[PDB]
Design a protein around this ligand. Structure first.
Ligand SMILES: NC(=O)C1=CN([C@@H]2O[C@H](COP(=O)(O)OP(=O)(O)OC[C@H]3O[C@@H](n4cnc5c(N)ncnc54)[C@H](OP(=O)(O)O)[C@@H]3O)[C@@H](O)[C@H]2O)C=CC1
Ligand SMILES: [Zn+2]
Lengths: 223, 303, 208, 126, 114, 95, 82
């Protein structure tokens, strides 16, 4: 943001060009920060809970070793490999080709999947499981079907109904001056990306981890 | 449970429901209606028959393409019964002839048939075995029929402890035994409380008990909503049959003169959850064959 | 071009061109398109206010007899406002000619019901009412021909699916034939056969 | 004649015979189909296809087929403009999602710039 | 939008024709339930006739109500004749549905069903 | 000639034999699983690997209009014999 | 108890968007300096009524409409909510 404000000042404003941007790896982090979640696991490192929902926790985010004895891990998802032995209640969520979802790319465009194949097994959708869990528990969620879900989606954040369309943000000056309160020491250790080669591109997901074609080309590249 | 035992979609006619039912007997009345409701559910019905293939031919086009299956059995060999319940989700016991033969009696049909099949279904390793028995089956006398069914209830409670003993009253239907037996006559006048219950409510109760657990182990009883007198029942069925008129064994006449009583120590239809229907609608349904051409609903409803 | 190519004639083409021009001259009120195809059959495309005047003119007038009526259909075309196209297919006896009077209509319009001037159009009109859904006013009898009585939905539309909504089976509960929602045993695999690469350049519509 | 004067939407959904389940339960996706990417031809464009959502296709337990409880799933309605698509979808009753038509971008390619002097558009293999 | 009518001019003749047709369907039921030898009392038949008339209650366009009057009059003619059998008149009812519930929870236990 | 699972039922040339938790074992009661006992893999490994003295050779299938359409296959690798996709029978070269 | 979230929903060509852009360009670093742990978040889509939503206390989502309010009026109503 210092580089961004530096080019913002020490130049003539030719237009609404944007120096600065970041990129992500997984789309649901963009969606979860649009809907207003806490990023990172520091709020769990501060307050160890008695009940936690792992909606697709892939790697070593938390374990039973980082938590009190009464865990009650409710895992929800498809072909879990890390955490699925560790968890307490396993719920078979659907997949990305198997439900009408709403996904956000790294630039805020909203793109939705289509139900091409119904999920095999019992294998309900995710919000359907959650609202049925709300009904069976002593409460309710004030909506029934998917159009009402998308109406509450607009009543949480409005860009998630204008499908396949983009609109960029602003306020680089306000973001930069809000960055000017907390000083951290910059550690001079050699920063390196983990995605360094072909094997680490191929293995570092759950769907690519479960397959065999990825394993064949992993052993073909490494050999 | 393996896959292809999970359900899929809607009900019936190549809509895979999740039960595989081995249904003993099933050639007569109640078994045919129960195979009708299971083919409407869209299941796999293994019916064994010992008779001619013409009667299972008449009950054949009920299920869908290859859903129901036919196999032979006997009342002597455990090997054919174990072959019948090799792999089955559920098994129901519906058997018993209302008159004796020269090869099989009232003795040991209800003792030797359910013990053998319950033994081989426990050893084959199935769950949810549903056995029908008649109401008021007691060790107390006046029917070889009823004392044998009481011994049968005690034996199927002793072996295979997680069984569903279920008992209907004198069920009536389109091809009934006792109401058709009343219409086919010529008679006396006495007093006896008796409550018929219609057959489709009973088999809806059976399919709800067969796919709705938390009802395993507990014995159930079917009580019709009427509970009235026999004399006005006979006069009502003659009045709806448009005839004034003011195998018949002694065991059958003592069954229709046995006072059917009910005890609420075992739950009925509402704790299982299906609506019961009164007599008169289905009575006007079944009482055809009046005369050449030929309402006055009595509705005694005693006590 | 001589072997295995159908030889067209120009005498019938010129005569049908002249006759279509003549028909549209003498009936200016109801005529919109007069087309002759490559194989010389006449088509006259018609507003639905003149079915009785055009057919009373064409059955008579002594210079075009056209006694006989053939196919009547109203081909169920989406994408338009007026969907259906009613095709009276008139055959002469003294002349050896074939004309197609194609009038247009939408879903909720009575056309003038040609049963009074062609007695052959009685069951044709009743069949088009039952199958498509186009009501015909001032007409003696409209019933359901070629469909079941308890069946409805006007099935020859493009909106009605291939398999119907009801399906009959016998059952022993009520001892009769009952109707249930359809549960097919096989998918009816629809094939994506319409390949690209524009097999006819002469029929290219102009783009936007 | 022309006696009726009214400006209102059409309500054919009570006349077309399809029940309320398949009226208010499914949804119509209205879209130009994408070009079949292994081929290179946009003759499969220019036709606004209306299709419905897909539903369950389980396995027929005697052969291994694809049984379905879906009458309306095997439809396709090829149209010619978005306006008539929206008009038919609102007329005949069901819900609709109208997607977008995405034209190929008009580029400018040049063999003479494939053989340039100082630029980095030097193909070095032809 | 000067549209040609079917029968009417506005909703007044529509209401008049539909109450005429309901009067005909009311006086047409007991003859048929005596004739085709059904199994259902007259009051339930009349209740489902008025249910079929209450099903299309949100229809406002006069041409559409005219066309529904035509449909009902055709089916009343086919039932006052002896052309339709016992099967179709029982097919108007629903005794063999085992009807699917409408709660979200029992639609959740038998899922993939919005 | 054929393999058989320890459930007692014959496998096919495709390995589709049922488990202990199915009901199609019960649909096979009294009626035999009519399996082809003649596998298609092992009737080619018994064939003689032909050796043809040219470099790129033809394959018809034994008869004009009785057999697959002509395929011309190349035999230039030294450790892997060329293999007709239609026939399945190999070739080699000799020089 | 207290607040959990404050959400602003804006557009890019409106007099109401003109007023709330005046507010959010002039007095936003003040507000974030005041309350640290309120994730008061701003959204802009294309054209919508400028809603202001306060989510707190078991799903009580109180709603005010910031249609053509000026910046003083926006700050006064925001302090009325908060
Ligand atoms: N009044 C009633 O109808 C009531 C009946 N029940 C019970 O309902 C069940 C069925 O009765 P229902 O249908 O009316 O009469 P059925 O006698 O016709 O039904 C019994 C079935 O089992 C078969 N069966 C009977 N005995 C033997 C045997 N020894 N060996 C082989 N098969 C035998 C019968 O004939 P087949 O051998 O040809 O298959 C038939 O398929 C009975 O168990 C009865 O206790 C209970 C309450 C009331
Ligand atoms: Zn070959």
């Amino acid at each position: 943001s210092n580089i961004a404000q530096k080019i913002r000042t020490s130049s003539g404003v030719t237009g609404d060009w944007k120096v600065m941007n970041i990129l992500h790896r997984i789309a649901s982090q963009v969606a979860a920060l649009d809907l207003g979640y806490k990023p990172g696991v520091e709020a769990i490192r501060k307050n160890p809970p008695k009940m936690l929902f792992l909606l697709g926790a892939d790697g070593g985010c938390v374990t039973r070793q980082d938590l009190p004895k009464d865990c009650f891990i409710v895992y929800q998802g498809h072909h879990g490999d890390v955490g699925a032995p560790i968890a307490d209640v396993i719920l078979p969520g659907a997949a990305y080709t198997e439900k009408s979802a709403t996904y956000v790319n790294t630039e805020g465009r909203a793109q939705q999947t289509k139900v091409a194949v119904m999920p095999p097994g019992l294998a309900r959708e995710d919000w359907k499981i959650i609202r049925a869990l709300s009904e069976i528990a002593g409460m309710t969620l004030p909506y029934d079907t998917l159009d009402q879900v998308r109406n509450r989606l607009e009543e949480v954040s409005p860009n998630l109904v204008r499908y396949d369309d983009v609109e960029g943000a602003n306020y680089f000056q306000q973001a930069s001056e809000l960055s000017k309160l907390v000083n951290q020491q910059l550690l001079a250790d050699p920063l390196v990306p983990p995605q360094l080669t072909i094997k680490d591109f191929y293995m570092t997901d759950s769907i690519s981890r479960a397959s065999q074609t990825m394993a064949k080309c992993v052993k073909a590249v490494t050999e | 449970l393996h896959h292809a035992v999970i359900p899929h979609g809607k009900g019936g006619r190549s809509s895979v429901s999740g039960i595989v039912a081995t249904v003993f007997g099933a050639t007569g009345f109640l078994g045919r209606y129960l195979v009708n409701h299971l083919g409407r559910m869209g299941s796999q019905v293994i019916v064994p028959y010992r008779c001619e293939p013409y009667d299972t031919m008449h009950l054949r086009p009920m299920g869908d393409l290859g859903q129901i299956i036919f196999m032979d059995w006997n009342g002597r060999d455990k090997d054919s019964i174990r072959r019948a319940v090799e792999h089955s989700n559920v098994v129901i016991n519906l058997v018993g002839r209302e008159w004796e033969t020269k090869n099989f009696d009232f003795e040991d049909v209800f003792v030797k048939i359910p013990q053998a099949i319950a033994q081989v279904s426990k050893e084959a390793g199935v769950e949810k075995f549903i056995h029908i028995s008649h109401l008021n089956a007691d060790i107390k006398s006046s029917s070889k029929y009823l004392r044998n069914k009481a011994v049968g209830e005690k034996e199927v409670r002793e072996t295979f402890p997680e069984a569903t003993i279920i008992k209907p009253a004198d069920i009536f239907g389109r091809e009934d035994r006792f109401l058709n037996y009343f219409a086919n006559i010529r008679s006396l006048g006495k007093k006896t409380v008796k409550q018929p219950v219609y057959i489709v409510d009973v088999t809806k109760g059976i399919i709800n008990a067969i796919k709705d657990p938390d009802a395993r182990g507990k014995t159930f009883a079917f009580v019709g909503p009427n509970r009235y007198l026999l004399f006005d029942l006979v006069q009502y069925v003659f009045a709806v049959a448009h005839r004034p008129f003011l195998w018949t064994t002694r065991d059958k006449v003592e069954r229709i003169h046995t006072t059917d009583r009910t005890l609420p120590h075992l739950p009925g239809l509402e704790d299982l959850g299906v609506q019961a229907t009164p007599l008169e609608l289905k009575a006007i349904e079944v009482l055809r064959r009046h005369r050449t051409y030929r309402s006055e609903i009595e509705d005694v409803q005693p006590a | 071009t001589r072997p295995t190519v159908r030889p067209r004639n120009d005498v019938a083409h010129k005569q049908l061109s002249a006759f279509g021009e003549y028909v549209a001259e003498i009936l200016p009120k109801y005529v919109q398109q007069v087309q002759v195809s490559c194989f010389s059959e006449l088509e006259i495309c018609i507003h639905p206010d003149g079915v009785i005047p055009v057919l009373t003119f064409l059955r008579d007038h002594s210079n075009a007899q056209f006694k006989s009526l053939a196919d009547l259909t109203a081909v169920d075309i989406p994408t338009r406002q007026n969907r259906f196209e009613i095709v009276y297919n008139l055959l002469s006896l003294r002349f050896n000619s074939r004309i197609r009077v194609k009038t247009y209509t939408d879903e909720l319009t009575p056309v003038e019901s040609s049963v009074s001037v062609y007695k052959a159009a009685n069951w044709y009109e009743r069949e088009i009412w039952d199958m498509f859904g186009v009501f015909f006013a001032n007409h003696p009898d409209l019933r359901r021909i070629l469909t079941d009585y308890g069946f409805e939905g006007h099935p020859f539309r493009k909106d009605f699916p291939l398999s119907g909504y009801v399906e009959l089976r016998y059952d022993d509960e009520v001892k009769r034939v009952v109707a249930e929602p359809v549960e097919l045993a096989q998918e009816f695999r629809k094939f994506d056969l319409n390949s690209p690469w524009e097999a006819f350049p002469a029929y290219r519509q102009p783009p936007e | 004649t022309q006696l009726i004067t009214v400006d209102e939407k059409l309500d054919i959904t009570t006349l077309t015979g399809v029940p309320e389940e398949h009226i208010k339960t499914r949804k119509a996706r209205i879209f130009v189909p994408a070009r079949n990417n292994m081929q290179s031809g946009v003759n499969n464009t220019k036709k606004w296809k209306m299709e419905f959502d897909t539903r369950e296709r389980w396995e027929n337990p005697l052969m291994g087929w694809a049984s379905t409880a879906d009458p309306l799933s095997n439809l396709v309605l090829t149209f010619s403009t978005k306006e008539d698509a929206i008009a038919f979808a609102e007329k005949n009753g069901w819900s609709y999602d109208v997607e977008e038509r995405k034209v190929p971008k008009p580029k400018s390619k040049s063999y003479g710039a494939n053989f340039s002097w100082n630029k980095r558009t030097r193909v070095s293999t032809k | 939008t000067s549209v040609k009518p079917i029968f009417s001019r506005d909703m007044n003749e529509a209401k008049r024709r539909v109450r005429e047709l309901y009067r005909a369907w009311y006086r047409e039921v007991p003859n048929t339930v005596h004739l085709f030898q059904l199994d259902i009392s007259v009051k339930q038949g009349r209740d489902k006739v008025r249910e079929m008339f209450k099903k299309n209650a949100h229809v406002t366009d006069p041409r559409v109500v005219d066309l529904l009057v035509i449909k009902g009059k055709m089916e009343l003619e086919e039932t006052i004749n002896v052309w339709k059998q016992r099967t179709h008149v029982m097919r108007f009812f629903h005794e063999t549905e085992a009807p699917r519930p409408k709660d979200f929870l029992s639609k959740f236990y038998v899922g993939h069903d919005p | 000639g054929v393999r058989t699972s320890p459930t007692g039922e014959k496998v096919t040339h495709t390995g589709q034999v049922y488990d202990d938790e199915d009901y199609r074992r019960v649909r096979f009661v009294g009626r035999q699983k009519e399996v082809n006992e003649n596998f298609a893999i092992d009737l080619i490994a018994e064939q003689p690997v032909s050796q043809v003295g040219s470099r790129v050779i033809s394959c018809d299938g034994g008869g004009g209009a009785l057999g697959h359409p002509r395929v011309y296959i190349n035999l230039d690798k030294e450790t892997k014999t060329g293999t007709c996709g239609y026939c399945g029978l190999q070739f080699r070269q000799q020089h | 108890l207290g607040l959990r979230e404050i959400r602003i929903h804006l557009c890019q060509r409106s007099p109401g968007s003109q007023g709330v852009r005046d507010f959010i360009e002039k007095r936003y670093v003040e507000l974030k300096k005041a309350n640290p742990d309120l994730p008061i978040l701003i959204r802009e889509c294309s054209d919508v009524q400028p809603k202001l939503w306060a989510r707190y206390a078991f799903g009580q989502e109180k709603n005010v409409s910031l249609n053509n309010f000026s910046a003083d009026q926006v700050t006064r109503a925001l302090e009325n909510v908060l």
